[PDB]
Design a protein around this ligand. Structure first.
Ligand SMILES: [Mg+2]
Ligand SMILES: [Mg+2]
Ligand SMILES: [Mg+2]
Ligand SMILES: [Mg+2]
Ligand SMILES: [Mg+2]
Ligand SMILES: [Mg+2]
Ligand SMILES: [Mg+2]
Ligand SMILES: [Mg+2]
Ligand SMILES: [Mg+2]
Ligand SMILES: [Mg+2]
Ligand SMILES: [Mg+2]
Ligand SMILES: [Mg+2]
Ligand SMILES: [Mg+2]
Ligand SMILES: [Mg+2]
Ligand SMILES: [Mg+2]
Ligand SMILES: [Mg+2]
Ligand SMILES: [Mg+2]
Ligand SMILES: [Mg+2]
Ligand SMILES: [Zn+2]
Lengths: 49, 182, 116, 79
RNA sequence: UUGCCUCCUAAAAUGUAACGGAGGCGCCCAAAGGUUCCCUCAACCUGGACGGCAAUCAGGUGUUGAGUGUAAGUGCACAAGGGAGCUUGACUGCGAGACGGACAUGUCGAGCAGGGACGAAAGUCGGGACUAGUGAUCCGGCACCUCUGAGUGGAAGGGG
């Protein structure tokens, strides 16, 4: 598909909140960015599911 | 507490001679060397960029400062070259390093050239700038003989403050390159 | 060992180790070893640096080796091919210069064989 | 024989919307445009899609400033 | 031929048909986003080993003729073009006032709080210079919840 949809989930609470798109061929590895998690209340790293 | 011999010569006698023999209005109309540029384009980088490493090594050995790597600003299909690849390396000499390189050149490299018949006085471009090329690099004594694998030439250019061609020709003759007589 | 950018063989008699140098061959090696008095049968395991260095000194003082040799060879080739000499034209055509029997032999100069 | 044309888009209703001498409220839209045919001035901001909107109440006044077409808002005196 | 985007016909507000005249779209980018800092091309002329009408270097002329991922138009030399350091605001809770329309759709937005990025500071940041890259209702799946639970306590099921 070239452009699969992916879901980002927090680490401690483990809740799926954000959804984006990425190119697997260009980025075989998983994504690792920092986003705002409402329930946690602080910016924490989010790892692609 | 040190000063290069060529710089001493220029600031002691060359400037006075030029001023006397051209009759300038003020003190600082006498031309002076600004910078020296050394570069070379290989053209084979499109197939093998390994030779670029040897080119950089040779340039560092001859000069003593890390040179550049230059890309291409256009893509030519007939020359089978596209954007982004490296093509050649350059380096600029100023001040004490420039004087030392010029002195070493005139003292060693030029006399050591095989079949050296002089330099054409027609190499100027009108405004007082000299440029010429070389075919073989091992003439320089700083690069050892057996460590080189392939022959690579280079082009070196000198720029002065001379207003016209005659001023620069006189200044560089006073410096004393082996000019040809015509 | 190593000399003038030439990797001396791990274990070879000096009479051929010096031969491996492009500027020195069999009889030149024989004469050089006779002059230096060095035995021509010993192995590389007993080689020592000082004798090698003095040998390098003698050979560089008395002869021209490797890149210089190449350079005058191609200088000769280019001058002969530019002056229009018979050897120059033969080099242009990639054929023997002495004028041997090109009829069947000279495959060494003509390179591989291609059929028509 | 036939034709391969005959397809078109919709109409975006572009163009100036509030003319000089009028009175506008805060956050009003003054001009809709593709490029920066006009430019923001005083008390006027440039939107995401190159649209112009007012920041404070007043009266519109078209004007130019050093090779530009600009829109300005004057602070009409309070009665 | 059947939907969406750009131009002309379209008679200098908006709008305006035809089997009229021309073209694209059913993508792409983890940087081609955010912020801070710096620079300006194409072309022509003159000199240089291969090197030539064009490869890399030096000097001179050069105010938009180069360039803007993708078709057109509107713009951009103050840059929205080119080069570099850091980083994910390609957020959460909200929204005064408007833009046009038969209806359902679409679009812009100053400003407050939480917790961030950039910069010494003033300040910008709710994806991409702008306009296309998409699909209502019903039915069902997945994660979570201080909702409900057919006598009571659970569970099944139903709910946001
Ligand atoms: Mg990458
Ligand atoms: Mg000059
Ligand atoms: Mg239209
Ligand atoms: Mg934007
Ligand atoms: Mg946008
Ligand atoms: Mg109109
Ligand atoms: Mg009608
Ligand atoms: Mg079509
Ligand atoms: Mg960037
Ligand atoms: Mg220039
Ligand atoms: Mg830029
Ligand atoms: Mg409303
Ligand atoms: Mg805040
Ligand atoms: Mg805001
Ligand atoms: Mg941008
Ligand atoms: Mg139905
Ligand atoms: Mg019950
Ligand atoms: Mg349940
Ligand atoms: Zn969380």
């Amino acid at each position: 598909d070239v452009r699969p949809k992916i879901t980002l989930a927090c680490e401690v609470c483990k809740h799926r909140n954000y959804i984006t798109k990425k190119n697997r061929r260009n980025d075989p590895d998983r994504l690792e960015i920092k986003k705002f998690c409402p329930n946690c209340g602080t910016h924490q790293p989010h790892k692609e599911s | 507490k040190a000063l290069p011999r060529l710089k001493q010569r220029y600031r002691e006698e060359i400037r006075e001679a030029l001023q006397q023999e051209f009759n300038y209005a003020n003190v600082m109309q006498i031309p002076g060397v600004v910078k020296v540029v050394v570069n070379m384009g290989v053209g084979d980088a499109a197939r093998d960029a390994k030779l670029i490493n040897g080119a950089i090594n040779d340039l560092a050995l001859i000069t003593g400062q890390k040179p550049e790597v230059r890309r291409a600003r256009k893509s030519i299909a007939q020359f089978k070259l596209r954007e982004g690849m490296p093509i050649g390396a350059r380096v600029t000499l100023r001040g004490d390093r420039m004087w030392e390189f010029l002195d070493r050149l005139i003292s060693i490299a030029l006399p050591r050239i095989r079949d050296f018949r002089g330099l054409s006085p027609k190499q100027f471009d009108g405004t007082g700038n000299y440029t010429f090329g070389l075919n073989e690099q091992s003439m320089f004594h700083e690069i050892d003989v057996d460590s080189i694998d392939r022959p690579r030439g280079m082009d070196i250019t000198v720029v002065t403050t001379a207003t016209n061609d005659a001023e620069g020709r006189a200044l560089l003759r006073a410096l004393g390159f082996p000019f040809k007589e015509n | 060992a190593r000399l003038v950018g030439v990797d001396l063989p791990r274990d070879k008699r000096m009479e051929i180790a010096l031969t491996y140098i492009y500027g020195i061959g069999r009889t030149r090696s024989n004469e050089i070893l006779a002059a230096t008095g060095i035995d021509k049968n010993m192995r590389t395991k007993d080689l020592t640096d000082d004798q090698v260095t003095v040998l390098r000194d003698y050979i560089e003082g008395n002869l021209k080796v490797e890149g210089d040799l190449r350079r005058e060879v191609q200088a000769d080739i280019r001058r002969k091919i530019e002056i229009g000499c018979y050897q120059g034209l033969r080099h242009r055509r990639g054929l023997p210069v002495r004028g041997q029997r090109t009829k069947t032999n000279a495959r060494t100069r003509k390179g591989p064989k291609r059929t028509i | 024989s036939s034709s391969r044309n005959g397809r078109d888009s919709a109409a975006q209703r572009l163009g100036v919307k509030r003319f000089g001498g009028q009175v506008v409220k805060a956050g009003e839209i003054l001009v809709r445009q593709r490029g920066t045919h006009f430019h923001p001035g005083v008390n006027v901001g440039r939107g995401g899609d190159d649209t112009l909107f007012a920041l404070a109440p007043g009266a519109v006044e078209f004007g130019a400033k050093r090779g530009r077409k600009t829109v300005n808002i004057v602070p009409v005196a309070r009665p």
